[PDB]
Design a protein around this ligand. Structure first.
Ligand SMILES: Nc1nc2c(ncn2[C@@H]2O[C@H](COP(=O)(O)OP(=O)(O)O)[C@@H](O)[C@H]2O)c(=O)[nH]1
Lengths: 426, 52, 96, 39
């Protein structure tokens, strides 16, 4: 019954979503031609959450691409598994985003977002009992933040009763792609903290540290990073596709995690992440999957939880396991690390178990924490913002497109008060 | 038929002029209100650093 | 027997008026929750967002009493980056 | 300081009269939303 529509904003979001759809197609057992060639019926019992039967098995994904150039769209078509999306959903302008927040939120947004809303509304009305929205984008660009964030706002205003998952690749200081990343990040979080319901925050710094330490890769190109982000977004919502011993809907996860309506930024990791060499030696049972889950170096975020406190955690296990074992694991972890936890919330950990492990693996787990140490990214981005806003550097490219200083100050103040809200509870 | 056309044209012209003048007035008023709300937002943001 | 019957009846009716203390409130509470849910049929939670001028004009006469449930506490700094400039002010004509 | 005492006691007294007014109708419960601070 319940289903999720998906949107891939910008180049980063588009490639992450393409890998996500490859992962989902592999898990559900369908060919790149669209036909079903899996093995069991538990997967095709609930494919309607992400796919639609078109004509005789040619399942079509329920996602919409979105950018301002045709090159990325052509790349995703030419890549494997790119021959399944509906061509009516390849919405894209032609002029060029220019990695500019104004150019992706005030001109090209105003010239293409009526169409993107039209197609997403068509899909959301084709699907019967909506459950939420899923969006993939980066908070360091122009059309990653502008286009995607304006779409988030419009969709929130139009369907203000559906849980929303926005997956945001926040900029990281060491991997500095462009020059206006702090500006875009500020102007994007200003709207996310106000409209969108939860963003899972990820970063390339930790996505590389994981690949260098745990995976022990030699030359990790973007394929492996997108693979990890996929394997996270695939297991974020499995209680829908597959039965479970203790199910957990997306709304249940949201209500257990978010204590106050403005503390909804989730820092996420996945287990097990075993190197190709040491996997044959490694042992995989619950009281080491949980140890790696709470390992501070497995987190896909450059904010060590030992620098803050945990408000709430969520552990989604996959596979046939022992629920009492899981619960004693969480309890003894809390008692061992009582200091890292908030006092006025008993049993800060919500645990869920699903009955179908991923392709090949026999046990798996996903961690979603709401720690108050995530204020570090916002503090750093605000510092990088105010390093440039004192001298109005690179500001005429937004002033000429029609944004004052008032909204910049608003966004910076929003970040500052958000940091204050995290810090006060801690 | 001449009476028909004359009356309908008169109604169309009066609707035209009403709509145009009213739209201009609303645009001016909305500009004033936008200035006012920007002022209030600046005051709200500024009073954060003020001591008690 | 008549007095005993009346005593039993009055005691039981008092014990049930104890229960009716719990029906009168459920009348007024449902009425109050129904008069308000009637105004959220258009925009259930988007209407809860007012403009800045409306928000300032509504509470008191230019104020705002934030409910403790939202968790937005901008009027109180986390005490880490606290501000107190009273000490810096000069106390002697030399300082002046 | 006597004036401060007067105004503080009057503040407490008006909290009392307002809670009494709300409870007398009972249309709200004793307390909703925010919690007043006490001097
Ligand atoms: N994980 C991942 N990140 C990527 C990939 N390609 C680009 N990025 C990140 O995306 C950022 C570029 O932002 P961009 O999407 O061009 O901004 P936009 O044009 O407004 O959408 C860079 O900082 C990269 O770190 C990818 O394949 N995988």
């Amino acid at each position: 019954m319940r289903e999720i529509v998906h949107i891939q904003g910008g180049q980063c979001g588009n490639q992450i979503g393409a890998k996500f759809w490859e992962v989902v197609s592999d898990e559900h057992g369908i060919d790149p031609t669209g036909t079903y060639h899996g093995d069991s019926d538990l997967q095709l019992e609930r494919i309607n959450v992400y796919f639609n039967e078109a004509t005789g098995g040619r399942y079509v994904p329920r996602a919409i691409l979105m950018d301002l150039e045709p090159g990325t769209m052509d790349s995703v078509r030419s890549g494997p598994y790119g021959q399944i999306f509906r061509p009516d959903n390849f919405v894209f302008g032609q002029t060029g985003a220019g990695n500019n927040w104004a150019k992706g939120h005030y001109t090209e947004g105003a010239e293409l977002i009526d169409s993107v809303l039209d197609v997403v509304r068509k899909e959301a009305e084709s699907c019967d009992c909506l459950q939420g929205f899923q969006v993939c984008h980066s908070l360091g660009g122009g059309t990653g933040s502008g286009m995607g964030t304006l779409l988030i706002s419009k969709i929130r205003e139009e369907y203000p009763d559906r849980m929303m998952l926005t997956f945001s690749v926040v900029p990281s200081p060491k991997v500095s792609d462009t020059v206006v990343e702090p500006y875009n990040a500020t102007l994007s979080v200003h709207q996310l903290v106000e409209n969108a319901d939860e963003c899972m925050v990820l970063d390339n710094e930790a996505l590389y540290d994981i690949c260098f330490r745990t995976l022990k890769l030699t030359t990790p190109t973007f394929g492996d990073l997108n693979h990890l982000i996929s394997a996270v977004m695939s297991g974020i919502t499995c209680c829908l596709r597959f039965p479970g011993q203790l199910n957990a809907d997306l709304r249940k996860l949201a209500v257990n995690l978010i204590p106050f309506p403005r503390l909804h930024f989730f820092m996420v990791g996945f287990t097990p992440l075993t190197s190709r060499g040491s996997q044959q030696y490694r042992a995989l049972t619950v009281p080491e999957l949980t140890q790696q889950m709470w390992d501070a170096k497995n987190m896909m975020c450059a904010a060590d939880p030992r620098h803050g406190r945990y408000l709430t955690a969520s552990a989604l296990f996959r596979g046939r396991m022992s629920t009492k074992e899981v619960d004693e694991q969480m309890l003894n972890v809390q008692n061992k690390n009582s200091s890292y936890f908030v006092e006025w919330i008993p049993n800060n950990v919500k645990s869920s178990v699903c009955d179908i492990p991923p392709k090949g693996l026999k046990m798996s787990a996903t961690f979603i924490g709401n720690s108050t140490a995530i204020q570090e990214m916002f503090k750093r981005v605000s510092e990088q913002f105010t390093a440039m806003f004192r001298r109005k550097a690179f500001l005429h490219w937004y002033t000429g497109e029609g944004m004052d200083e008032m909204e910049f100050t608003e966004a910076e103040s929003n970040m500052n008060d958000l940091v204050s809200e995290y810090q006060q509870y801690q | 038929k001449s009476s028909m056309d004359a009356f309908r044209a008169g109604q169309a012209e009066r609707l035209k002029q009403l709509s145009l003048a009213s739209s201009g007035a609303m645009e001016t008023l909305r500009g004033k209100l936008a200035v006012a709300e920007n002022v209030l937002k600046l005051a709200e943001l500024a009073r954060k650093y003020e001591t008690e | 027997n008549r007095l005993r019957v009346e005593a039993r009846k009055e005691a039981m009716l008092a014990g049930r008026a104890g229960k009716f203390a719990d029906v009168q409130a459920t009348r007024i509470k449902t009425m109050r929750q129904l008069i308000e849910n009637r105004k959220y049929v258009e925009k259930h939670r988007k209407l809860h967002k007012p403009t800045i001028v409306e928000r300032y004009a509504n509470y008191g006469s230019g104020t705002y009493a934030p409910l403790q449930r939202e968790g937005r506490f901008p009027e109180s700094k986390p005490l880490g980056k606290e501000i107190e400039t009273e000490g810096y002010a000069p106390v002697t004509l030399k300082g002046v | 300081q006597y004036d401060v005492a007067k105004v503080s006691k009057a503040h407490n007294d008006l909290i009392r009269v307002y809670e009494a007014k709300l409870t007398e109708f009972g249309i709200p419960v004793d307390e909703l939303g925010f919690r007043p601070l006490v001097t």
